[PDB]
Short mmCIF file of C-alpha atoms in Angstrom, two decimals:
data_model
loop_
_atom_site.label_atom_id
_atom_site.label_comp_id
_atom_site.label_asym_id
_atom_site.label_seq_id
_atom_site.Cartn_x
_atom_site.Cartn_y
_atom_site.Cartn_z
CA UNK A 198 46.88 -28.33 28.32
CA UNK A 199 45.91 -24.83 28.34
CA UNK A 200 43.48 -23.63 25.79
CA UNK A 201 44.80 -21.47 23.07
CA UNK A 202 44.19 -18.01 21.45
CA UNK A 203 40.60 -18.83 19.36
CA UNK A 204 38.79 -17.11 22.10
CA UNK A 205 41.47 -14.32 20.94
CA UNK A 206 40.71 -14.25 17.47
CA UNK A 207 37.17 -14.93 17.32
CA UNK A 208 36.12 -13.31 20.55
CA UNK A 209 37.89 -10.32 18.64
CA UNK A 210 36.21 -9.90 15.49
CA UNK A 211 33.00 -10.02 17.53
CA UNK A 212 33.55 -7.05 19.77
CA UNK A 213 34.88 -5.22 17.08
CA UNK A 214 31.81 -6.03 14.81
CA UNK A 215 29.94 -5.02 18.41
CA UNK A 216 32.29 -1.45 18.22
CA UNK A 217 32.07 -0.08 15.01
CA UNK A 218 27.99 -0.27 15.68
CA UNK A 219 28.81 1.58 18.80
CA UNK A 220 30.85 4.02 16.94
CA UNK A 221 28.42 4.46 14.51
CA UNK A 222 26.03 5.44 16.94
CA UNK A 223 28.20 7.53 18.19
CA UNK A 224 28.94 9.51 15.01
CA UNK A 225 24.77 9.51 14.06
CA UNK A 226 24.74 10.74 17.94
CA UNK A 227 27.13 13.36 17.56
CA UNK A 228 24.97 14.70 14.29
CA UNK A 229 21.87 14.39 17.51
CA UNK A 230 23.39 16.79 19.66
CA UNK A 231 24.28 19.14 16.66
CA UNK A 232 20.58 18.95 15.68
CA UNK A 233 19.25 19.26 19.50
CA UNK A 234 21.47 22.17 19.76
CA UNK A 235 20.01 23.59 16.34
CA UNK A 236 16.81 22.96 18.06
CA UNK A 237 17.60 24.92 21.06
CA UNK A 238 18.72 27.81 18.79
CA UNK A 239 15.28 27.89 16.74
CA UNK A 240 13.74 27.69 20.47
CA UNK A 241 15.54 30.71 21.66
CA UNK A 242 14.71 32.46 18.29
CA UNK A 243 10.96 31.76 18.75
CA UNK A 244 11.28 32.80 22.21
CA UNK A 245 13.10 36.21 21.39
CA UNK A 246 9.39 36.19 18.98
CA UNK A 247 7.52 35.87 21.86
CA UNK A 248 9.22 39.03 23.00
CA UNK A 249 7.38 40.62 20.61
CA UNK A 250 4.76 39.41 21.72
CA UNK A 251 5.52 41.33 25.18
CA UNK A 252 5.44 43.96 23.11
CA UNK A 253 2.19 43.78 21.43
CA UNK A 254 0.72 42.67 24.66
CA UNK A 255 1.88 45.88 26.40
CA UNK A 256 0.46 47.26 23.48
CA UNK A 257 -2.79 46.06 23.64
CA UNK A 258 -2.87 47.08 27.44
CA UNK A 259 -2.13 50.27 26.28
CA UNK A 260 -5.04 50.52 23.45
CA UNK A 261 -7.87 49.43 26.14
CA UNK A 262 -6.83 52.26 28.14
CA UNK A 263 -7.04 54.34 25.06
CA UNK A 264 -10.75 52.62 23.96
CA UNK A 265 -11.99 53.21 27.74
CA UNK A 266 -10.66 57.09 27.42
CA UNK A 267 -12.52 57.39 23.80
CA UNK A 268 -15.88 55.92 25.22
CA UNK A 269 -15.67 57.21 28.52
CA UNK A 270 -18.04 59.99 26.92
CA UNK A 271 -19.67 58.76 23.42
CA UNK B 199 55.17 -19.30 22.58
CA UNK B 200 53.23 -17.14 20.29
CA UNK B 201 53.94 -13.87 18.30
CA UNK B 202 50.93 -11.98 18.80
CA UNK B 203 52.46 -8.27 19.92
CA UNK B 204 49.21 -6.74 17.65
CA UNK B 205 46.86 -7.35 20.77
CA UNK B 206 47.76 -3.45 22.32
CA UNK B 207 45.97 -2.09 19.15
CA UNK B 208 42.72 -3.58 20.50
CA UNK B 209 43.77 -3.06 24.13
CA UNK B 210 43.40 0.48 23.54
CA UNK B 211 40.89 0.48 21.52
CA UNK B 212 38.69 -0.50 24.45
CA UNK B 213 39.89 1.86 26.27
CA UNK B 214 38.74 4.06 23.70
CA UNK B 215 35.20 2.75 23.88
CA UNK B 216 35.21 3.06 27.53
CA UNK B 217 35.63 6.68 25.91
CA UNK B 218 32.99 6.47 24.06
CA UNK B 219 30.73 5.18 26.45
CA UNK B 220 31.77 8.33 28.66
CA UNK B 221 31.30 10.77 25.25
CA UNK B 222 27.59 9.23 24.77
CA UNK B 223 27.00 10.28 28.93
CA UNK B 224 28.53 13.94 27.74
CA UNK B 225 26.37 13.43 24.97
CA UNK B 226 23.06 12.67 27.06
CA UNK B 227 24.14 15.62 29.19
CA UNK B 228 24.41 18.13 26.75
CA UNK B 229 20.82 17.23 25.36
CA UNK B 230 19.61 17.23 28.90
CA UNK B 231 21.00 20.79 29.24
CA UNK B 232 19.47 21.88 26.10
CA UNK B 233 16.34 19.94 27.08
CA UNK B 234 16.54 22.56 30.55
CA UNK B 235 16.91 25.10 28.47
CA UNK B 236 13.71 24.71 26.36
CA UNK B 237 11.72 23.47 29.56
CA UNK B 238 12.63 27.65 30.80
CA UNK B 239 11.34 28.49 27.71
CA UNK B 240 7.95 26.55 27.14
CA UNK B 241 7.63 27.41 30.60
CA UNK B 242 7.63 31.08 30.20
CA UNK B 243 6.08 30.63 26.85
CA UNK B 244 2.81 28.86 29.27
CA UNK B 245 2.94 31.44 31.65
CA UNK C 198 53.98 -19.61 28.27
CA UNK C 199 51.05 -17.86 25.36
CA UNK C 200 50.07 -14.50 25.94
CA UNK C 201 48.56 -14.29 29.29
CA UNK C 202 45.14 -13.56 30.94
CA UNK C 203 46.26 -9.84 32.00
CA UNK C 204 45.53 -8.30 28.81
CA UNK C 205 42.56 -10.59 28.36
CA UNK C 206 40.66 -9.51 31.43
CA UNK C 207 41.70 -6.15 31.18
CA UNK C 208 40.06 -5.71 28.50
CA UNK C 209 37.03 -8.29 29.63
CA UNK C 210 36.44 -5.69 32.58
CA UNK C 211 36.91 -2.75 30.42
CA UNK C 212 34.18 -3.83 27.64
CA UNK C 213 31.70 -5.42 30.47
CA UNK C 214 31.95 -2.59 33.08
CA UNK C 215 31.89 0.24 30.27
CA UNK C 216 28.62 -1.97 28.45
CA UNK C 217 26.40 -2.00 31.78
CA UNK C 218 27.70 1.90 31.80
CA UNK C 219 26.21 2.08 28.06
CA UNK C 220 22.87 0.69 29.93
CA UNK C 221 23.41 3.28 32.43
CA UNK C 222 23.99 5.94 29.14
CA UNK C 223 20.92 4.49 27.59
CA UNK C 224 19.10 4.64 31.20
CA UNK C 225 20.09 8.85 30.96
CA UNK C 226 18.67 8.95 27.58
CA UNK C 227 15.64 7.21 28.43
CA UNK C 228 15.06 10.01 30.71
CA UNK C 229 16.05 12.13 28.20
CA UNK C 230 13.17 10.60 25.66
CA UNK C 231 10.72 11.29 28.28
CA UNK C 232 11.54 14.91 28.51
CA UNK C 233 11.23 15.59 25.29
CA UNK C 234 8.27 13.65 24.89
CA UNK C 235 6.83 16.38 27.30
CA UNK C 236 8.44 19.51 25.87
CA UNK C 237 7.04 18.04 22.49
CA UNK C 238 3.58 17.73 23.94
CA UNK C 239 3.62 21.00 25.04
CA UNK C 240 4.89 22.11 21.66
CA UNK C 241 2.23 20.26 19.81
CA UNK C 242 -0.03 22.09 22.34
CA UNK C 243 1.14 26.00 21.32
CA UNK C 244 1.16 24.97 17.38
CA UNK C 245 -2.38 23.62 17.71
#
């Protein structure tokens, strides 16, 4: 005689015990890539800062040419 | 025989976690993209 | 005769091919860890 649906039922509750966890990581996984993309923003942000920093470096090129004009005589 | 019609509610709910299992690879992706995107950055940020 | 091995094994093949394809996922996200573990050394590096 063939066997009979326990391997359904059982087997069933398992992998659904097995699938919520992988739902819940999906869910905690989805609030991940939210965050990593937060992340990214605040890395763009502090790389628009480093911009800045362009700036002032172009600025400082700019003020040793000045300090080697001013000394060039006293 | 039996009466057990309710199996196609778990049938597709695999089906759904094969799904999921291809949202989690869009999800390793996206980070990877992101994770691109800051390697240009620190890169410039080195240089 | 009871309900049949076609559902059965579909789903059997669905849940085993897709859970070596979460190993592959976790495999990707592995080498995801180890990028950012170097983007966050070299973070670690421009705070210090």
């Amino acid at each position: 005689s063939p066997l009979q649906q326990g391997d359904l039922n059982a087997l069933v509750t398992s992998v659904q015990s097995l699938a919520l966890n992988v739902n819940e990581i999906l869910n905690t996984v989805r609030n991940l890539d939210s965050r990593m993309n937060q992340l990214e923003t605040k890395v763009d942000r502090i790389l628009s800062s480093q911009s800045l920093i362009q700036t002032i470096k172009n600025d400082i090129v700019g003020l040793k040419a000045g300090m080697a004009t001013l000394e060039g005589m006293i």
